[PDB]
From a paper:
Subsequent studies in C. elegans, Xenopus, Zebrafish, and Drosophila confirmed the role of UNC-45 as a myosin-specific chaperone, promoting the folding of the myosin ATPase domain as well as coordinating the assembly of thick filaments during muscle development. To better understand its myosin folding function, we established an orthogonal protein folding assay in insect cells, characterizing the interplay of the C. elegans muscle myosin MHC-B with its cognate chaperone UNC-45. Structural data of various functional mutants clarify the role of the distinct UNC-45 domains in this process providing important mechanistic insight into its myosin folding activity.
Surprisingly, however, deleting the entire TPR domain fully abolished the chaperone function of UNC-45. Accordingly, the TPR domain does not only serve as Hsp70/Hsp90 docking site, but accomplishes further critical functions. Finally, we determined the crystal structure of the UNC-45 ∆TPR construct that represents a C. elegans UNC-45 variant in monomeric, non-filamentous form. The asymmetric unit of the ∆TPR crystal form is built up by two molecules. In molecule A, the UCS domain adopts an extended conformation similar to wt UNC-45, whereas molecule B contains a UCS domain that is strongly bent, with the entire domain and even more strongly its C-terminal half (ARM repeats 14–17) extending away from the central domain. These data further highlight the pronounced structural flexibility of the myosin-binding UCS domain, which is held in place by non-covalent interactions with the adjacent central and TPR domains. Accordingly, deleting the TPR domain releases the flexible UCS domain to adopt various conformations, two of which were captured in the present crystal form. (2) Our structural data suggest that the TPR domain obtains an additional intra-molecular scaffolding role. It undergoes van-der-Waals contacts with the UCS domain, thereby arranging the myosin binding site to accommodate substrate. Our structural data reveal the capability of the UCS domain to adopt distinct defined conformations. Together, the wt, G427E, L822F, and ∆TPR crystal structures depict four different UCS conformations highlighting the pronounced dynamicity of the myosin-binding domain.
Residue numbers in the entry: 136 to 508, 525 to 619, 622 to 915, 926 to 939
């Protein structure tokens, strides 16, 4: 009950009214947040047989309450409901009836409208999917199809609630975006979500049609709160659904639903004033197509009825319809040349739309010209981006899109870096617009470190063509120029712009960020600074929630950050514990990036702090991964780092005894690696670990009987070239004869006895041998 008394103290100071100051209540909250996050017993005591949730719910219903206080209560509650027992008890505890308690939890995001509150409520619904299917996107934990169908009736209640909230006009835009992010993360089994057939039921049901209505929206024309940030949340989850319809029976069915939606819209494309807005919703739809499931929409681009309606709304006198046509046709330009089958005619059209002076039309007319790139267009975007107070963030998003399309040229990149106040504009963009511009800003960082071509898989064949005068390499992609670009970007703060746009799910763009971060951590002087701005929080979240292709680079960037770092400053606690899972999955010897040595140096720094660090590594089946690098003969950086890792990992009690255990043949290599003693890197480890292993008597007996031809090894480490390897080894031999006298009896009768007595007459092993002599 000392637990039960220490939750009573923090209980009165949070809920039962013991506070004459806000920050001391914040102190009790931050104490409980640490307290529940440290043990499961914290989540037991704070639960208090369910006494927690009503205190919190009467806290949320304050209009006078600070933001960070309430969000702190949620940061406790979602940690509380990580138990599957407690969360399922929580789910229906808000109504004797089932589905109204379901809707009461789903409408918890509509209490307030700050971005932080809505992102933490989406963590609350996330932990529910983690309670039902027993799945985890954070720990790559697959669901159990046993327990999914065991409580299917709860799930259908939830899906109805969500597809109710998607067309519920009483719900604001930032919350509706967060619902869509829950469909992206937790639904798809291709993304490790709800299993097969579930998404087939959703398509067979009317929820897909709700999403198609949502893609046909804008903040300017809506029936319900939509922001411009919403569409990029829609288009990804639509492409992820296309990634989840694995059978061509179902892709047949998917094309069959969406054509009914489309042809109903074109049945409603009339010239009437009612009929204009269906043309505008078609324009909002097709751009949402091209941003995501590019594949289906081009099959609808070949429909030839489209482009005269594009001309009608361009000749219309409403400027909203013309600005939306500009951003339509600029999304039409693809990497498929049959888009030009529609696009070959509209080339001068936007060339005319720049001539109009409406700026909302103008910046959308500026992009695309940026796509087909000529340095004067960069001079023009220069004009829009530097103007901050006058222009809105909705306009200044499009200039970033135009400049990312301009950043394909190598020579314009240098003109970009020569500006500093541009970057001042970039940080004041990302920290004011938040996560609004992620595809494009990451597209720029990829172009700056040349991270698109960072898959240099084709350069191996290009130099095979050079094995046979004609081509043109370009000098602005030389390693020194990129070192200039990158040191300029780190000097003017790319990292806080990265974490402010990190609140999305865009694996296209989150790939582009990981690729840029990997080139950023190439140099050691700035990576401590990158860590100083929270880059570790960023990279770990990246390797948890990016594209699977980007996770290799994400963990590799994590590996470069912590190579020779002090891990206590660079990784506090919970941040350190989750480090093990990503990089142990990167150790594939058949891959062999220059990541493996970075991996092992990181882990060896990690293994020196605490037992909970090094214990969680063995659970990850790291040991068979480390042994194969430790079996290698050719490499030098790898095997000694695996040895120094395995040097530090013998502090763990159980691993110390797994090596002494009779099933393994590892103690052979701990001494034979002191014998092939051409180098000092591996010999120093295999003699220090030997000095640790031989303090145990049963470990000494397994040396002699299990090693044929052993005194040859000991005479080699006695008549020894290096001095440090030899002196560590001799104390690990000194404790042998201290242990058992029958083994020491097999030492005087052996060959090595004469060189042992030879060395004592010359440093530290001298009195070790003298101690050995006392046995007789």
């Amino acid at each position: 009950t000392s637990l039960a008394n220490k939750v009573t103290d923090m209980e009165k100071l949070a809920f039962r009214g013991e506070a004459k100051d806000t920050e001391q209540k914040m102190t009790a909250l931050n104490n409980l947040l640490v307290l529940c996050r440290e043990s499961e017993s914290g989540a037991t005591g704070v639960w208090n047989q369910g006494a927690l949730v009503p205190f919190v719910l009467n806290l949320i219903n304050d209009a006078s309450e600070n933001e960070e206080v309430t969000v702190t209560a949620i940061r406790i509650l979602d940690e509380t409901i990580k138990n599957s027992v407690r969360c399922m008890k929580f789910l229906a505890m808000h109504d004797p009836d089932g589905p109204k308690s379901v809707r009461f939890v789903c409408r918890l995001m509509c209490k307030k409208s700050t971005k932080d509150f809505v992102d933490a409520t989406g963590i609350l619904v996330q932990r529910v999917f983690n309670a039902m299917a027993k799945m985890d996107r954070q720990k790559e934990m697959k669901p159990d199809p046993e327990v999914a169908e065991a409580n299917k009736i709860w799930i259908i209640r939830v899906l109805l609630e969500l597809q109710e909230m998607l067309q519920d006009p009483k719900v604001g835009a930032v919350q509706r975006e967060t619902c869509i992010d829950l469909f992206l993360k937790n639904l798809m089994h291709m993304d490790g979500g709800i299993p097969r057939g579930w998404s087939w039921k959703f398509v067979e049901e009317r929820g897909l049609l709700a999403l198609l209505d949502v893609a046909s929206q804008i903040p300017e024309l809506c029936e319900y709160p939509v922001s411009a940030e919403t569409r990029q949340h829609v288009a990804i989850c639509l492409q992820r659904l296309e990634e989840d319809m694995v059978f061509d029976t179902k892709r047949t069915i998917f094309k069959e639903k969406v054509d009914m939606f489309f042809n109903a819209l074109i049945s409603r494309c009339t010239n009437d004033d009612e009929g204009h807005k269906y043309r505008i919703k078609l324009s909002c739809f097709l751009i949402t197509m091209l941003q995501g499931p590019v594949d289906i929409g081009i099959n609808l681009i070949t429909n030839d009825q489209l482009t005269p309606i594009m001309l009608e709304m361009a000749a219309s006198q409403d400027h909203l319809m013309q600005g939306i046509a500009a951003e339509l046709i600029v999304a039409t330009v693809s990497k498929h040349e049959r888009a030009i089958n529609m696009l070959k005619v509209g080339i001068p059209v936007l060339r005319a739309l720049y001539d109009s002076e409406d700026p909302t039309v103008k910046v959308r007319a500026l992009v695309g010209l940026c796509k087909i790139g000529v340095i004067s267009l960069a001079k023009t975007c220069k004009k829009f981006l530097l103007e901050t107070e006058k222009y809105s963030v909705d306009i200044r998003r499009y200039a970033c899109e135009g400049l990312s399309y301009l950043s394909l040229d190598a020579d314009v990149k240098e003109w970009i870096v020569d500006d500093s106040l541009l970057l001042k504009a970039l940080v004041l963009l990302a920290k004011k617009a938040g996560a609004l511009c992620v595809y494009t800003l990451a597209t720029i960082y990829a172009n700056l470190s040349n991270a698109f071509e960072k898959p240099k898989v084709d350069e191996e064949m290009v130099k095979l063509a050079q094995f046979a005068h004609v081509p043109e390499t370009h000098p602005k992609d030389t390693e020194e120029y990129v070192e200039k670009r990158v040191r300029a970007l780190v000097e003017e703060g790319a990292v806080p712009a990265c974490v402010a746009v990190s609140k999305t799910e865009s694996k296209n763009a989150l790939e582009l960020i990981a690729r840029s971060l990997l080139a950023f951590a190439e140099y050691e002087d700035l990576r401590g600074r990158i860590i100083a701005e929270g880059g570790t929080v960023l990279c770990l979240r990246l390797t948890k929630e990016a594209s699977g292709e980007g996770k290799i680079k994400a963990g590799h960037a994590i590996a470069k950050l912590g190579a020779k770092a002090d891990p206590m400053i660079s990784f506090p606690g919970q941040r350190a514990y989750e480090v093990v899972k990503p990089l142990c999955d990167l150790l594939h010897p058949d891959v062999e990036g220059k990541a493996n040595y970075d991996s092992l140096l990181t882990l060896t720094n990690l293994a020196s702090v605490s037992d909970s660090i090094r214990g969680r590594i063995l659970k990850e089946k790291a040991i068979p991964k480390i042994e194969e690098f430790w079996f290698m003969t050719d490499h030098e950086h790898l095997r000694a780092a695996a040895a120094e890792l395995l040097l530090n990992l013998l502090f763990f009690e159980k691993f110390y005894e797994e090596t002494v255990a009779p099933g393994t043949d590892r103690l052979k290599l701990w001494v034979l690696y002191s014998a092939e003693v051409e180098e000092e890197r591996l010999s120093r480890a295999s003699a220090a670990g030997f000095a640790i292993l031989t303090e145990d008597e049963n470990a000494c007996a397994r040396i002699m009987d299990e090693i044929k031809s052993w005194p040859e090894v000991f005479k080699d480490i006695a008549m020894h070239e290096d001095a440090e390897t030899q002196r560590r080894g001799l104390m690990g031999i000194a404790n042998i004869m201290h242990s058992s006298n029958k083994l020491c009896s097999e030492i005087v009768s052996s060959e090595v006895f004469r060189v042992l007595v030879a060395v004592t007459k010359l440093x530290x092993x001298x009195x070790x041998x003298x101690x050995x002599x006392x046995x007789x």
